[PDB]
Ligand binder design. Sequence first.
Ligand code: FES
Lengths: 135, 255, 643
Amino acid sequence: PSIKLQSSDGEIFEVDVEIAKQSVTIKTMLEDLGDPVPLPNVNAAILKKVIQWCTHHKDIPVWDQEFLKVDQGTLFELILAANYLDIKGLLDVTCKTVANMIKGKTPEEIRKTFNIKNDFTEEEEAQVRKENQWC
Amino acid sequence: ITHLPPEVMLSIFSYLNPQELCRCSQVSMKWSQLTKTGSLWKHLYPVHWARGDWYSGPAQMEKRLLHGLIHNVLPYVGTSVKTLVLAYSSAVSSKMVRQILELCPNLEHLDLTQTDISDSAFDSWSWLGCCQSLRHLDLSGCEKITDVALEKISRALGILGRVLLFLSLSGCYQITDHGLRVLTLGGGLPYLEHLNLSGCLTITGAGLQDLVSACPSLNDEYFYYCDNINGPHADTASGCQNLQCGFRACCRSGE
Amino acid sequence: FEYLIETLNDSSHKKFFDVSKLGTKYDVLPYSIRVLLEAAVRNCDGFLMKKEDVMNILDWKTKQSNVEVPFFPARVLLQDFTGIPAMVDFAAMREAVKTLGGDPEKVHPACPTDLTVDHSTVLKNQEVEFGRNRERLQFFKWSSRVFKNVAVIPPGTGMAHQINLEYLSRVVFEEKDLLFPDSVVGTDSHITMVNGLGILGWGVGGIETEAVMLGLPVSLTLPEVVGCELTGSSNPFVTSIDVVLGITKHLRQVGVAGKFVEFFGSGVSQLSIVDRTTIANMCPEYGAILSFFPVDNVTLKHLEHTGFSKAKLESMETYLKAVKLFRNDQNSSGEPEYSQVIQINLNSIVPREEVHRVEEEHVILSMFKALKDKIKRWNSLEAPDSVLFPWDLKSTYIRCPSFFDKLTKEPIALQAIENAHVLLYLGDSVTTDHISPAGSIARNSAAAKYLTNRGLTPREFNSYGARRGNDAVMTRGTFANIKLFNKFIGKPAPKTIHFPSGQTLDVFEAAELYQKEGIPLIILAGKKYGSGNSRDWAAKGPYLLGVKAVLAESYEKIHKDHLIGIGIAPLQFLPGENADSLGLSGRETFSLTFPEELSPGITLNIQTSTGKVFSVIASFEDDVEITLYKHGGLLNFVARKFS
Ligand code: FES
């Protein structure tokens, strides 16, 4: 029929059971207790996108390629939501997208695109740069 | 990207070839330990990689790669290596192989076709089970291996272990009846479905009958051996594949 | 050039072509271009050997490597069994001439062939290899009995390659009171060894020998001669191998690549014939084509020992001196003008007569006469003696091919290909090892399905080269290399797509389904189609599959001629175009029409079923190839002359 998912911000979302059948954690949480189930680890701004992806696969694609074009603060939140719901398809397609964002890039600009802190010391940085080649 | 748990960064670090996997290794101190977990270095092709082909799939610049991933990678990964394809290598000695086979004990697929390999490249294989769970072993063209390499291969498979599914001694013209009577020890090979002895011209059908009587799963379409010999399955097996071939050894020219 | 035929002296009766009367530039040529000019002046029949090509080997000072000339050898060597595809073709031409109103006995090779079969447990394998090579040895025995030119050296002699080639040496030929110098091009691996004895001979592929036995000449660009002056007596303690490696090392560093290395000077008389043959047999080491040691007094003092009589050696002297092919070590009057001389003083060799004086009356004289009586299982082997070969119909080794079916003398007009279907769609650098079969027969191939219907076990499938007399096995291995990258399939699989039926099966099984429907075939390829050496069935295979033309961006020059001489029109895309510049996927129907009077290098329009016309260059070089194509091939053209 319809299952009720509650986000972190107090809002309740309704969706069909076959949609939540792909959510392995929900599929395992719907065969033991037998509608108002809360999800306090995913925000509604990410639920609106994860349910949008999940309803498309009710049965890399270009629809996924256009759907996965957002800010990193939202893409990585989507990945953290797919890890919590164990949606293997979404998790795998977002892993593919992120690993595509790393294809052919020097280790210097990786930190610039992903906003990483160079937490190296010169005695290790010279040891790490020396052993990763053979390259 | 830092809020992601390590189990998701490990999944992200799977669509990256080993060149990108080592570029990412010098971004942060967490990735430096996280790109050498072992689930990312299962299959390694040191000859395709030092050619522009970074495959890392299920199944010169070259000396630098074999010297790099022998002190920089294989000690750290290091026991989670599944395959190792050194086929048609320009710079691979019996020393650069004795040091890879000592760090990969869970190897599943060796491939040493047409390499300057002697029967001393298997000296690291002595504790009776060294590289068990080995499924594929391709030594086609290593004409320098005698029946002493097979005494270390028949020991480095274990006991019933002995899960070899492929054996391609195709050109190793120096193995004899003792080189095959030793493979039928402990087991012998009960899963072997392919036995390419096409080129070993100095074995005898009496010593090959003893080998075939210990490989019950042997497919006969994939049982090649010398044409000038009277081994088993004469009306169902195949003949030598090294006819009209300059690469591999052959007792006749087939011209 | 029938006016230089001067009679020799009063020795017995002989005549010869006195090339010395060609001008004041003949005494200037090297001694290896004089052999080319002599062989060119007596075969100048106007069709194959032009007259514009005799005044092209004579103008050698200015017409070096930038010009190509033909060469008419005096004989042909063929290795162990590389002569089967030629002798089977002649045995089939005998029948094709019989069933045409012709005498099946004029059919002989156009030059003396020598089938050196003993070339290319250790003893227990010999009996099995004989029992395996029994039908082919029987065919060689019949062919030696039947054809006047052909001669066979049976398997088992002394010992591999060295004095068998000196026993066949006939340095001055006799053919109907004519005299001319020897020349031996063939598929023997040690065939350059004859150069250290005054015999201009190099190595060619199997197709080129098979085409020289049919009257066509070997093509060749005017080489550069690097005449290596070799003066001074060697040091009192040097060996033969030391001097040999010294000369070889001095020639390797100067870099003689694809050029004649004729030797001359006053120290050449110190090199024995066993040393000249050694320096000649090592041409691939310093990268040369030949190392010609002209005929001098040492050569004849060697011939006197080995086989020949005095009444023959005096005539040889007189001929070689009257035509200026004799190099006097102490009477050098006419000195050549090599394009790049090299000085080698033999006083610069560090590690003689005591060993050279031995081989004069010692074993050499005995070894040659012992081999003369070396020529057990060969004169014990039943073989036919009839004019036509008694073909065995249950045979899988020797089969009469279908090149002459049907022959129909006075050839028909040029048939236009109509509604062909691309059999193969290939890439760039398609070597002849992908076209021609070789190696063991694959257990899952078309040839294995053929040989299994004949009742052969999988271990009785021989190699693909041990069944080169059987044309069915050979055309079932054409384009059946597991590394064949067919662009209809993608991945490198030895298969193709039958278009009217849609299925994916072997190349032979597709060409065969195309044959039953009467649909011609073509082939699309890329750059340097047919690269590499010339293997047999590299042009026979495609022709017997049903191919009528080949489309490629560029062929190898050696393979374009073998395609023309089998009846496969080799076509090139206009400069700039290719397959991926016209929208051709390879699934249309191409239609040609050779208009009339095929001039060399003519452009002809190929049409399609998708309404896409495009011009394509008919890569015909000269009128010899245009005529070989108008006659449906070289074998048909030759068989029409015997009828
Ligand atoms: S290797 Fe012995 S038969 Fe080919």
